[PDB]
């Protein structure tokens, strides 16, 4: 029974590993590294604005309470 | 245990279905592509974090700020 | 007891040195001024309520719109 | 000793009662309440504003509670 | 100016009806019943002052409980 | 017209000034001082637990917001 | 497209697994402890949801009390 | 190359698929549903009492605004 499927496990394994690895490799990975990169440097944006805002937001807390 | 080893499927096919990959071209796309996987992840929720910590903070500065 | 009689000064005191003056122009002029003067004062202190009133209660609706 | 007091109270009496009557009458009264009519004015503004505000508070606190 | 006038009866009254009272007990029981009676509302303001002030403060030691 | 009047008031100086100088003197003032001081001893206790506490209340804050 | 295939292996893998193993007992024993799992996931996400959901609506009900 | 590997994932697909059918069976998933389902019946727990304060929460905040 597992030899149908082990098997076809192996037809996929070449099939998509000899095959893709000339043409569509670096037509996918070089543009999901692209969007990826894109949204790194989208979070990196977010992420700054929250911590310099939250070290503005603490720094007003420390005078209003003194003051 | 049946998990335990179905694990066991995802970890040592992966293993190898890289380790066949390509070594020279692959060893610096995976990499890069992996670790910002993880690192856009990361920062997604620390974003989540700063976000509440912000408005939560940003609640305490209106508090001071009204009488 | 001094005060009481000390107020019974400044009661029939105020009470003839309106009545000795004219009683046409002035029952119109102090009236006027009499009655103005409490109403500005009364509404002074509807300000002071208020403008507490708004405060605090801006705190809360600052409070529902943060999440 | 009271006599020396009692009519002195006597002498400013008549010497502010039907003397002011005439020429410093309408030049102090007239000018004091038509500062204290401005100042009317001026609170009948602001008690206005914050009980309109009072209801725009109020009302925007029934919709983000239900909501 | 009538009770510029209504005033001058009020001070120089008290002033006559304490000089004229004994010198020697009413120096040590007036002094103190004014002195007290100062004192007195003094403190009742400074209370509904630190009533709030507590109040508001609690408020904000709440918020920092919280989370 | 004056004259029915600062006389009755002449009346009442000597009818209260050496009557109740007397035995109804510190049958008023010693009882009166004596609730008064009683409140200013209740004043003095709760702008004590107001003060304490506000200086428990801005203690706790300092710790809280550094932690 | 690695993955894709690579939970390729993680899907078929399971479905066989399942249905080679004794189809009596684990029809009840595995449906079961699915089904329960996931239950308890939700409840736990449920229950970190409320956690805040009271927090932050707590903080408003001591607003309304204070004053 | 992947002979040596395929082989040996059906090597262990027989060592534990009729092997622990038997005796290790209802040895762990009847101990793990145990614990499963006490903790579900303790997360239930939970977000009853969670659910049931945010009932009690948001019915004083009625009681409380409108009044």
Do not use: A, L, S, V
């Given at each position: 029974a597992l030899q149908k499927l082990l098997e076809s496990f192996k037809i996929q394994y070449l099939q998509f590993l000899a095959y893709?690895?000339?043409?569509?490799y670096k037509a996918s990975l070089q543009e999901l590294l692209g969007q990826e990169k894109e949204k790194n440097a989208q979070l990196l944006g977010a992420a700054q604005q929250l911590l310099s805002h939250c070290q503005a937001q603490k720094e007003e807390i420390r005078r209003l309470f003194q003051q | 245990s049946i998990e335990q080893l179905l694990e066991r499927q995802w970890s040592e096919g992966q293993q190898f279905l890289l380790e066949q990959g390509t070594p020279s071209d692959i060893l610096g796309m995976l990499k890069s592509l992996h670790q910002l996987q993880v690192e856009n992840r990361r920062l997604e929720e620390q974003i989540k974090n700063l976000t509440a910590k912000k408005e939560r903070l940003q609640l305490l500065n209106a508090q001071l700020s009204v009488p």
């Open positions: 893709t690895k000339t043409p569509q | -």
